Amino acid sequence: GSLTEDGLSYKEKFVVRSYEVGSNKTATVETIANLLQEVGCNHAQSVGFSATTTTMRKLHLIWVTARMHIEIYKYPAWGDVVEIETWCQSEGRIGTRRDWILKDSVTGEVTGRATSKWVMMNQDTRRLQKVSDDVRDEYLVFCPQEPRLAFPEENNRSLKKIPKLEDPAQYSMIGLKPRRADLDMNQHVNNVTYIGWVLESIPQEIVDTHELQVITLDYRRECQQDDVVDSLTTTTSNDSQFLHLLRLSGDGQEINRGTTLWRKK
Amino acid sequence: GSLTEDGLSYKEKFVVRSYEVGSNKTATVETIANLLQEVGCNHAQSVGFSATTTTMRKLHLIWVTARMHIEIYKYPAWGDVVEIETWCQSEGRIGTRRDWILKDSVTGEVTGRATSKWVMMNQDTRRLQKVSDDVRDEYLVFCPQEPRLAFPEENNRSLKKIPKLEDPAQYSMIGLKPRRADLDMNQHVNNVTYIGWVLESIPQEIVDTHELQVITLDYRRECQQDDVVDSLTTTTSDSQFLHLLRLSGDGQEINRGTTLWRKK
């Protein structure tokens, strides 16, 4: 992969692997989420990151995901090349937004798009804090000045408020624990794992007869290695809508909430 | 990736991804196992497999892993290119062996090597079948005639018999269940998942202070989506461990194996 001509966005081509596909022989939504994560890491690496600025390191601050919104039109098949283009943009003192456009390398058509809201956080105390002006100036030079949105639409579902699932849930998957494969280089549970845990409570019949089109996911608290998660789901609807809730099986502490949208084949 | 000049082996270069590395910022053994699986799929695809022969489809025979042996000298770091070369060889009507050589694309040195024993079985009855001569002739043309072994040493770790762990186990990880990420395109639990489940019973203290050098794994029975696994481990010693994966319920054995670790 490489930075584009202006140096304000990054592109990368991926070949879909045999272990990355599902029952329909197309890439899973977790595989797509991993490729978005990977191209985002390479974008940071190509612009000078190790991903913290000199002020972020000085203050013990890190970038944490607060919301992930992914919309897929066509999942790449096993052996196909998928080109992902990513870029960042400042959302003032709120945080940063990172967007992605998934294209087909053969036809050039857009087969998917994603957006994410990132916030600043003290690595040691987990206290979420606003982006200071000194940190903002250090990374603004790598962002387009004019707004470039993957989801620009008058009323996009990427900015819609998600409600809390009320008990009893229609479906559930209980006793979900992470293994060493679910952790990242810093020993924290990977953000893609939460997507897989959310989808575990969707019935197998829905998966076998429908295709996942849209997935919005709010990140509230992070799951430790020694934590057990419960995935709860309820239908809220030609298409199928679901409300989701991940929570610690013990006290019932909320870690994630979200919605998925599916369509018939 | 592509077939080599003779068409008797396949090579492929992989760039280690950020999500594929562990706390030491090098590729995990499960990542390496996935890359071996991937290069093996592409080798079959490049020789005419749309992964069974015409007689295997006609009958209902599939290739099933019986044993996986992996030895790593250096794990590639995040962002490094790793070149894997794979090839097949016939082991008579007993089965088929697939070998791999992991090389560094920058220096050309061998940073790891793997071997696996594959057995034929009926997709429907799951009965371990022998390999017929008709099937043998259909794939022998893609294998070197003279033996080409990644582990040629007379009486080595890859062909050593593995004993059954006796209760009580020193360590354990219980209630392990597979999720949709653990299944493959055919809905069966991926062979790499068992490696990850075996290593779940190794204490975090051992992982944090040691590097996994050798891993041998016998595959006895498949774990279904609705099955719960128990990972049991005992030190038998560098550090040596004996492993056992079994169904949480009846205690039915699904996997047995050994790992060898080195101090950093």
Ligand SMILES: C[C@H]1[C@H](O)CCCN1Cc1ccccc1
């Ligand atoms: C930490 C990452 C995250 O992926 C999205 C938000 C910020 N980004 C850092 C970055 C990378 C390239 C250019 C400018 C800012």
Ligand SMILES: C[C@H]1[C@H](O)CCCN1Cc1ccccc1
């Ligand atoms: C199914 C696979 C398995 O991965 C290893 C054993 C057999 N192999 C098929 C193959 C591919 C290329 C050349 C000859 C035989």
